[PDB]
Structures are given as C-alpha cells and as structure tokens.
Design a protein around this motif. Structure first.
Motif, PDB file in Angstrom:
ATOM      1  N   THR A 180       0.835  -1.195   0.000  1.00 50.43           N
ATOM      2  CA  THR A 180       0.000   0.000   0.000  1.00 50.43           C
ATOM      3  C   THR A 180       0.876   1.254   0.000  1.00 50.43           C
ATOM      4  N   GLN A 181       1.881   1.295   0.898  1.00 53.77           N
ATOM      5  CA  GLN A 181       2.855   2.383   1.007  1.00 53.77           C
ATOM      6  C   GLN A 181       3.369   2.789  -0.374  1.00 53.77           C
ATOM      7  N   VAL A 182       3.758   1.801  -1.197  1.00 55.66           N
ATOM      8  CA  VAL A 182       4.274   2.054  -2.537  1.00 55.66           C
ATOM      9  C   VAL A 182       3.178   2.648  -3.423  1.00 55.66           C
ATOM     10  N   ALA A 183       1.959   2.085  -3.378  1.00 56.37           N
ATOM     11  CA  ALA A 183       0.838   2.546  -4.192  1.00 56.37           C
ATOM     12  C   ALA A 183       0.456   3.994  -3.873  1.00 56.37           C
ATOM     13  N   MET A 204      -0.423   6.875  -6.581  1.00 52.91           N
ATOM     14  CA  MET A 204      -1.731   7.494  -6.774  1.00 52.91           C
ATOM     15  C   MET A 204      -1.651   9.002  -6.512  1.00 52.91           C
ATOM     16  N   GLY A 205      -0.723   9.441  -5.636  1.00 56.35           N
ATOM     17  CA  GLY A 205      -0.377  10.851  -5.479  1.00 56.35           C
ATOM     18  C   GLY A 205       0.599  11.350  -6.550  1.00 56.35           C
ATOM     19  N   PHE A 206       0.374  10.915  -7.796  1.00 56.64           N
ATOM     20  CA  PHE A 206       1.178  11.245  -8.959  1.00 56.64           C
ATOM     21  C   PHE A 206       0.322  11.638 -10.172  1.00 56.64           C
ATOM     22  N   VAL A 207      -0.986  11.325 -10.146  1.00 60.47           N
ATOM     23  CA  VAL A 207      -1.959  11.778 -11.131  1.00 60.47           C
ATOM     24  C   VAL A 207      -1.873  13.293 -11.341  1.00 60.47           C
ATOM     25  N   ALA A 208      -1.706  14.060 -10.247  1.00 55.65           N
ATOM     26  CA  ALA A 208      -1.634  15.518 -10.259  1.00 55.65           C
ATOM     27  C   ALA A 208      -0.756  16.041 -11.394  1.00 55.65           C
ATOM     28  N   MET A 209       0.454  15.480 -11.509  1.00 57.10           N
ATOM     29  CA  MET A 209       1.394  15.854 -12.553  1.00 57.10           C
ATOM     30  C   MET A 209       0.785  15.573 -13.926  1.00 57.10           C
ATOM     31  N   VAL A 210       0.134  14.409 -14.089  1.00 58.15           N
ATOM     32  CA  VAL A 210      -0.371  13.955 -15.387  1.00 58.15           C
ATOM     33  C   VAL A 210      -1.567  14.823 -15.822  1.00 58.15           C
ATOM     34  N   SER A 211      -2.368  15.274 -14.844  1.00 62.83           N
ATOM     35  CA  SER A 211      -3.431  16.239 -15.075  1.00 62.83           C
ATOM     36  C   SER A 211      -2.850  17.598 -15.466  1.00 62.83           C
ATOM     37  N   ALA A 212      -1.806  18.043 -14.750  1.00 60.87           N
ATOM     38  CA  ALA A 212      -1.192  19.339 -14.993  1.00 60.87           C
ATOM     39  C   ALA A 212      -0.604  19.397 -16.397  1.00 60.87           C
TER      40      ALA A 212
END
Lengths: 51, 51
Positions: free
Chosen positions: A10-13, A17-25
């Motif tokens: 979970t720690q790794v995931a 999942m807190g990386f979508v932000a960049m892909v949206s930006a």
C-alpha cells in the motif's frame, strides 16, 4: 516469515496514486495547445465551405 | 489553465472581418459585367415586344 508485503504494498501505491496531479497538470498544458490549433482550424473550416 | 481563448479568438476574427473589402471589390467587378449584359439584354427586350 515476516510477511511485510501488503503493508509496504500500500505504502508504494500511495506514493504513485499521489502522482496523477502531474499527469493532469501536463494534461491542461496539452489542451491549451490542442484548442489553440483546433479552434483556429475550425476558424477557417466553416469558411472553406462558405462557397 | 492559461485560457488564452477569447483573447486570440477576437484577434483571429479581426484578421477576417478586415476581409470583406476584397469580397466587395470582386463584387463591383461582378456587377459591371452583369449590368453590361443586363442593360444590353433590356436593350433588345423592349423592341422584341415593339411588334
């Protein structure tokens, strides 16, 4: 034996999942371009078929 | 994000409302012809029905 698999699994995931932000930006900074051309394409597009 | 849509959206329109001039000019250089024939058509047209 230890079985620290799901706990860190979970720690790794959660790092990524807190990386979508960049892909949206970088998303937004795609569309502005794609509109720019697209909207400019549609500008002449009607007045091709003005005839 | 940036939203440079309407700002350039007017810019584009202003290039092409300043384009009627050509269509009027080629307009005038239609009618001179269309009169030439039309006025020449009406020349004989009365004197068809002179009888």
């Amino acid at each position: 034996d230890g079985f620290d698999a799901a706990a860190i699994g979970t720690q790794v995931a959660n790092v990524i999942m807190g990386f979508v932000a960049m892909v949206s930006a970088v998303g937004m900074a795609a569309i502005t371009v794609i509109l720019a051309i697209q909207g400019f394409k549609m500008a002449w597009s009607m007045i091709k078929s003005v005839k």
